[PDB]
Structures are given as structure tokens and as C-alpha cells.
């Protein structure tokens with residue numbers, strides 16, 4: 001039971017030590033496409049590079065590269081795309097990826113400005129009547145509606161393929177209250193965030209994978225996928241306490257580097273799963 005393992009690591013203060021065992025056990029795979037010179041500016045500096053084996057390819061004949069990975073959790077029947085916050089020059093690529101993978105949801109875990117720097121381009125429209133056109137990828141994006149809450153905002157967007165005039169509705173889930181430093185004190189509002197994403201149908205097998213991101217460094221994102229997957233596996237296992245967070249993290253770590261970044265994020269992920277369990281079970 002992870003609750004008892006929690007008190008043990010907490011009372012012993014061994015979070016940095018557990019995390020380092022994870023860092024040392026974690027997969028390392030080639031990322032040759034990410035390091036090509038022609039991809040330097042498609043790549044957010046001081047951000048993780050995608051492994052070649054799990055990387056999302058754009059369907060443009062020119063350059064197929066985006067900093068994005070497919071996490072496939074086989075048991076849980078859950079798949080996620082994890083990506084960097086778009087750059088001014090990759091906003092069109094980001095929406096092409098959303099279009100081509102048939103994603104219903106985009107999950108954003110950062111503010112556009114944190115610590116007085118831009119963590120991410122403004123990649124969606126701020127007003128109904130000012131839509132965005134991405135001329136490089138032949139897409140149009142319109143804000144349909146915006147629902148601002150205390151801890152998060154949900155936006156309905158319409159993405160239009162200007163080439164074929166097909167349109168789809170995309171949900172933008174923006175968690176707005178992650179602090180500039182460290183992790184939330186309680187996981188309550190984050191859990192209410194996940195449940196929201198779940199009830200929308202954005203994580204369901206009838207859609208392409210959800211797109212998750214949160215700037216570059218800090219960590220976040222990892223926490224989102226790790227909590228979702230751990231909770232769903234408790235709905236599946238005859239014994240819910242067979243679920244080992246560390247094992248799940250190491251599986252995801254086969255698909256993308258740079259989850260959980262800090263021991264604090266690891267601690268928060270335990271606390272989110274523990275409190276999510278008690279809420280359901």
C-alpha cells in the first residue's frame with residue numbers, strides 16, 4: 001500500500017533518494033531526428049527531445065518533425081501526446097498535429113508568462129471575433145466560448161481545415177493556478193481538473209490521444225498522465241494496491257524523457273493518486 005510507503009519516505013525524508021533511483025533506472029533511447037540541425041529552431045531550447053521510436057510525425061512531406069511523443073499505456077488502454085509549449089514558429093505545426101491525430105482535448109498546465117518570461121506562445125484566440133489563420137498549415141482556429149473558473153478555464157474552439165473545409169470542435173483545458181515555484185499544497189483542485197478532462201470524453205478511446213504540455217523544465221504534464229493512469233488501473237485490478245507508481249512512471253519513461261523532473265513533483269503525484277483513490281474508493 002502506497003499510503004504507508006508515503007509516510008515511510010515522508011517520515012524518513014527519502015524523496016530525493018527514491019527520485020534518483022528512478023532517474024538511474026530510466027530508459028535512454030536515441031533522439032537523432034530531434035538533434036538534426038534543420039530542427040534546432042523547431043526545438044524549444046532547455047526542453048527534452050523526443051525519442052525517435054515514440055515521436056509524433058507531421059504529415060508534411062517537407063519536415064515531419066515536432067517535439068511531441070506518444071505515451072501508450074497498454075493495460076490502462078490510455079494514450080497521451082506530450083509536447084512542449086509551442087514556439088512562435090511552431091504554432092501552425094501544433095494545430096496540424098491536433099488535426100492529424102484526431103485529438104478532442106488540449107490540456108495546458110502553465111500560464112503563458114511565469115517568472116517574468118514567456119513559457120509558451122499565445123496559440124489560441126482571445127476573442128470570438130478575432131480568429132487565427134495558420135498560413136503554413138492551412139488551418140483556421142476560432143474561440144466559440146470560454147468558461148473561466150477559480151482554478152481552471154475551459155475553452156471551446158473550432159479548428160477548420162481550410163484545404164477541405166472540415167471542422168472539429170477542440171476543448172482547451174487550461175489549469176491556471178499551478179504556482180510559479182513548487183507544487184500545489186493540496187491536490188484537490190488538480191484532481192477536480194482531471195475529472196473535468198475525463199467527463200468531457202477527451203481521454204476516451206473514441207478520440208485520438210489528448211495533447212498535454214506545460215512549457216519546458218519544471219515538470220508538470222508527467223504528473224497529469226501519471227495520476228490519470230494510476231487511478232484507472234485501480235478500476236481494473238482485482239487488487240487495487242498491486243499498483244506501483246514507480247513502475248508506472250518507469251513505463252511512461254520508455255516513451256518520453258523529463259516527467260516528474262523534481263522529487264516534489266514525485267511527492268505531489270503520490271499525494272494526488274492517494275487522495276484520488278479515497279475519493280473514488
Ligand SMILES: *[C@@H]1C(=O)Nc2ccc(F)cc21
Pocket residue numbers: 076077078205236
Ligand atoms: C478497461 C476495460 O476493461 N475496458 C476499457 C475500455 C476503455 C478503457 F479506456 C479502459 C478499459
Ligand SMILES: *[C@@H]1C(=O)Nc2ccc(F)cc21
Pocket residue numbers: 147154155156171196200
Ligand atoms: C466544463 C466547463 O466548466 N465548461 C465546459 C465546456 C465544455 C465541456 F465539454 C466541459 C466543460
